[PDB]
Every structure is written in C-alpha cells, then in structure tokens.
Design a protein around this nucleic acid. Sequence first.
RNA 1: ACCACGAUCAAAAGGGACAAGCAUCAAGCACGCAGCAAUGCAGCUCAAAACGCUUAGCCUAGCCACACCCCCACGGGAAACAGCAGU
RNA 2: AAACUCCAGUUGACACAAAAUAGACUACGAAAGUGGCUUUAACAUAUCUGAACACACAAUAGCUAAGACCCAAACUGGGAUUAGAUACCCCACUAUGCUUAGCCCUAAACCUCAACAGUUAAAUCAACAAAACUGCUCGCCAGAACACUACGAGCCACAGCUUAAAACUCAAA
Lengths: 71, 171
Amino acid sequence: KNVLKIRRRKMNHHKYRKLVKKTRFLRRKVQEGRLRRKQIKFEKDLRRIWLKAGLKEAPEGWQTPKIYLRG
Amino acid sequence: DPPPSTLLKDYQNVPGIEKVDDVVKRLLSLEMANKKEMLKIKQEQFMKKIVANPEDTRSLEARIIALSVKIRSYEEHLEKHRKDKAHKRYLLMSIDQRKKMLKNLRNTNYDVFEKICWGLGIEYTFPPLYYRRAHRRFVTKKALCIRVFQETQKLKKRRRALKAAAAAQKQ
RNA sequence: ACCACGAUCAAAAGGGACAAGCAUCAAGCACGCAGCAAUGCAGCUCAAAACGCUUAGCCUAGCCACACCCCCACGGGAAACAGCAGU
RNA sequence: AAACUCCAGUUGACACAAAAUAGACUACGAAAGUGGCUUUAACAUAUCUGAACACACAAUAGCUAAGACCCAAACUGGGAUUAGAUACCCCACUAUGCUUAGCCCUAAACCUCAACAGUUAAAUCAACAAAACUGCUCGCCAGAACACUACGAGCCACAGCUUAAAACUCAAA
Ligand SMILES: NC(=O)c1ccc[n+]([C@@H]2O[C@H](COP(=O)([O-])OP(=O)(O)OC[C@H]3O[C@@H](n4cnc5c(N)ncnc54)[C@H](O)[C@@H]3O)[C@@H](O)[C@H]2O)c1
Ligand SMILES: [K+]
Ligand SMILES: [K+]
Ligand SMILES: [K+]
Ligand SMILES: [K+]
Ligand SMILES: [Mg+2]
Ligand SMILES: [Mg+2]
Ligand SMILES: [Mg+2]
Ligand SMILES: [Mg+2]
Ligand SMILES: [Mg+2]
Ligand SMILES: [Mg+2]
Ligand SMILES: [Mg+2]
Ligand SMILES: [Mg+2]
Ligand SMILES: [Mg+2]
Ligand SMILES: [Mg+2]
Ligand SMILES: [Mg+2]
Ligand SMILES: [Mg+2]
Ligand SMILES: [Mg+2]
Ligand SMILES: [Mg+2]
Ligand SMILES: [Mg+2]
Ligand SMILES: [Mg+2]
Ligand SMILES: [Mg+2]
Ligand SMILES: [Mg+2]
Ligand SMILES: [Mg+2]
Ligand SMILES: [Mg+2]
Ligand SMILES: [Mg+2]
Ligand SMILES: [Mg+2]
Ligand SMILES: [Mg+2]
Ligand SMILES: [Mg+2]
Ligand SMILES: [Mg+2]
C-alpha cells in the first residue's frame, strides 16, 4: 500500500507543531487564564454545597485548596 | 521460617536419619539447600495445620496454601529487589489468583474457608463496586461534602435543645 | 329516591410500570436504616447509566397538561378571545 | 579543503563504554524486550472470557538532580559542493546514549491478523497477502476531508499526553 494517507497526517502534524511553536507565548497566557477560571468554577461549586445545606459560611476550618496550580 | 537444622522434606522419613554423623545431618538440612527447599517445609507445616487430608494436593485448600507460600516468597524477594518489575507482576497476579480461590472456597465450603483464613492469617475483603479514578477535584469535594454534613448534624441538634427549652418554659 | 355494610364510578395516599438525544453530564452530596421514644448506627443512589443538560404533548373510541405572566396565586405585575365570528 | 602536528608507528601499563565467533540455533518473557562470565533470588493461576480510565508495566526520544566519559552524536562552528545548500560529503565539539534517584507514558509499540475451544468436509476462495471455516466472548467500526484538531475533563505531564466533536466543503475518497 502507498503512504498517501500517512503523508496527509504527516503534514497536518508538522503544521500543527509549527503553529504551536510560533504562538507558544500567547497560548501560555491563555492557558493561565483558563486555569484561573477553572479554580473559580471549582470554588463556586463547593460554596453552592454548604449554602444549599443551610450553612452561612464554610465549615469551621475549611480552606478550598488550589488544585490546578503547578505547585 | 523453619530452623536451619530442619531436614529436607525428602530425608525426613528415611529410617535411621537420627543416628547419622552430624556432618551428614548438615548436608541434609535446610542450611545446605536453596530457599525453594525451605518453602516446601513451610508448605508442609501449613497443610497439617489446616487441611483435613494433608496428602490431597488438588483440593482448593491445598492450592490456596501452596499459592500463599509463593506469595510470601515474592514479598521477601521484592523487599530486596524493589525495582524488579517482573516479580512485582507475579506477586500482584498471585494475590489476585488467591482472592479468586478464596471467593470460590467461601461460596462452596464456608467452614473450610474460615479455617484457611485463620490458619494463613488472611483478612478476606470484598471487591469495590465501582472502578473509577478519585482525582483531586472529586477527593476535595467529597471531603467538603462530609464536613458540610457533619456541621448540619450539629446545627440540627442545637435546634432540638432550644425548642425543648422553650417548650418547658410554657409549663 | 331514602339506608344500601352492596354494586357502580373515581380522588388523595401506598406499591409497581412508563419518551428521545448527549457519558466531552461520572460521580450525586444526605440522597439510608434501626428504635415506642430518647437516641443510636453511617449508611443511601450510580457505567445494568445515578446526577445533569437538551428536545418533544402522548401509548389517539381517546388521554395528559395548561387556561395572560410570577411552576402555585394569599399577594404582586397588571387588565388578559389558547369560546364563536372577526381584526 | 579545512583540521592536527606534545603528531604517527612498534612495545608495555591501562574502563562507571560496548558485549566478534557460537547463531545455518529459534529459545526466554505479559508485552516492551532478552544472545560476554559467575553466583543468589526467580519466571501467577487444575475451566475460559473479562478494562483508553481500576491495578501494574511499557522501545527510542525527552524532563529534573547528582556522577562517569572510550566512542558515537541532534545542535553549533569550520571545510567543500551549488544558481542557492539553513542539506546530502569532510572535520571538530555539545545536549544525549551510561550509572543512581525520580518523572514522562509515546511508536509502522505491526507478525497492521483479539482471547479461548474445534475442523480440513462441504460451496475451497472477489483481488492481493500468510488456505478456508465453526463455536463462544470481549474490544472496536459505519463516505471523504475538517481531525493524532477545537472545546471540556483527567494527568508529577505546562510548546505535553489521554479521551475527542461540530460548522463550512465535495461526489467522491
Ligand atoms: N464502571 C465500573 O466500575 C463497572 C462496575 C460494574 C461493572 N462494570 C462492567 O464493566 C464493563 C465496562 O463498563 P463501561 O462500558 O461503562 O466502562 P467504560 O469503559 O466506559 O469505563 C467507565 C468507567 O468504568 C471503568 N471500567 C471500564 N471497563 C471496566 C471493566 N471491565 N470493569 C470494571 N470497570 C471498568 C473505567 O475505568 C471507568 O472508570 C461493562 O461490562 C460493565 O458491566 C463496570
Ligand atoms: K402556568
Ligand atoms: K561478546
Ligand atoms: K499506538
Ligand atoms: K511491521
Ligand atoms: Mg511498493
Ligand atoms: Mg492537511
Ligand atoms: Mg391517585
Ligand atoms: Mg464508556
Ligand atoms: Mg466538547
Ligand atoms: Mg435521566
Ligand atoms: Mg414544546
Ligand atoms: Mg391571549
Ligand atoms: Mg397560572
Ligand atoms: Mg377565535
Ligand atoms: Mg552473528
Ligand atoms: Mg483473565
Ligand atoms: Mg471501555
Ligand atoms: Mg493508550
Ligand atoms: Mg518508556
Ligand atoms: Mg535518559
Ligand atoms: Mg568523537
Ligand atoms: Mg558528552
Ligand atoms: Mg555498561
Ligand atoms: Mg517491535
Ligand atoms: Mg482480549
Ligand atoms: Mg468519516
Ligand atoms: Mg501522536
Ligand atoms: Mg491534542
Ligand atoms: Mg485542552
């Protein structure tokens, strides 16, 4: 069999890797922004739980951790 | 482990083995053999201790004992060879095979299943109902949901006393 | 007619059954049980699809739902043809 | 041509590198892999099937930290070729290949042929390839391209991996 199907995928992958390399500083700023909104969306979900259960503040001694940071 | 002076399983029932020279007793003991000879002695001790017929090796009881001795030898090997991935696989597979054996023994002969668990020191466990990753988001939310439940239970009890106290004042 | 310890018809309540698409909705977060109570136990649902989003009146001798909107209608917004004819 | 010229040849001393011949053998291991020597430990299961995600593994490249360094060698530099030569050819040298401790989780990871049980008779069978079938089970597929992509989610991964669409387009592929 010829490799024409492979060649189409080969060029797709080459152009994608080159695009990512050319815009890696913009994508890094976008990724940072998404992880922040992701952390906020997670904090809202936990706050919805204790508010709907009748509590006015988080359980005593609870601190929502940052589960999406590199550290 | 059996004492090093223990005779091999093959020379333990030969007539007159107690009257030979001390040198001959060393050459026929576990001290002068490989670890596999010591495991055959361990297996024999468990059989007489547990199974009803120590000569039947094809019963589900003898197989669980034989495999339990292999499992212990793999654990001892890995205590020294912690990067030996091949034997780590053999250990985990053997533990799975023993659990399947114990499941089949528990279903068919419970009285024998209890003696095996006691004799070998096995704590039987039932498998989990679901197999799914407990990632960070889930682990965190589950811990928060348990705290919220614990706090709501305290507030519901403090709403019983106040209602009870006010009710007594009317009298 | 009236009682019918009855029949017929048929609510509320209890049990069971009951649409489609998406799993890139995979966990739900109190959803259980015991006890006369006090209270105790920590359980309950879920890849055999819970929880969720989206679409749609349906299984048509007909049935369900709605009746300007706020699911409801004390109250409020407000002043009502989704009755017929008509604009 | 550049390069070296404390260079070259013989002789002696001399590895944290790599393992002629055997091998015309076809073995071991779940796969990846495994072919110098010795020893220790050691290669699951007395029905089968059973997972992108559970559990444990997984060539090469790559990341983090500390070491070793013969040789090889991305990159880079020099020489040459050429219309040009960011290549192919020559030289030098680095990351890297090694060890230790952690990661990363990919392959034409393909013998592109799922596991188990059974058959060689019937219709033997599109073509080619490695003859054609039966039972049973799990996984997967439903025009091409968009797409090993976007978004969401998970992940020690932050130019990553896994899962993975749609719109616009064509009447073919
Ligand atoms: N999800 C479960 O943990 C679970 C529980 C009981 C039975 N099963 C059986 O597993 C099979 C696969 O189910 P699916 O199509 O929903 O899975 P899937 O492949 O869509 O995976 C969904 C989830 O189930 C897990 N899973 C996948 N294969 C599994 C298997 N063989 N056994 C157990 N867990 C598995 C995955 O890790 C993931 O967490 C079915 O035969 C189902 O009956 C699965
Ligand atoms: K209404
Ligand atoms: K060799
Ligand atoms: K692959
Ligand atoms: K191949
Ligand atoms: Mg060809
Ligand atoms: Mg393309
Ligand atoms: Mg009713
Ligand atoms: Mg699934
Ligand atoms: Mg999406
Ligand atoms: Mg539903
Ligand atoms: Mg509608
Ligand atoms: Mg109107
Ligand atoms: Mg109304
Ligand atoms: Mg009208
Ligand atoms: Mg050879
Ligand atoms: Mg199996
Ligand atoms: Mg699956
Ligand atoms: Mg994979
Ligand atoms: Mg690897
Ligand atoms: Mg490396
Ligand atoms: Mg060199
Ligand atoms: Mg180097
Ligand atoms: Mg070496
Ligand atoms: Mg290979
Ligand atoms: Mg299979
Ligand atoms: Mg297609
Ligand atoms: Mg790829
Ligand atoms: Mg991707
Ligand atoms: Mg993404």
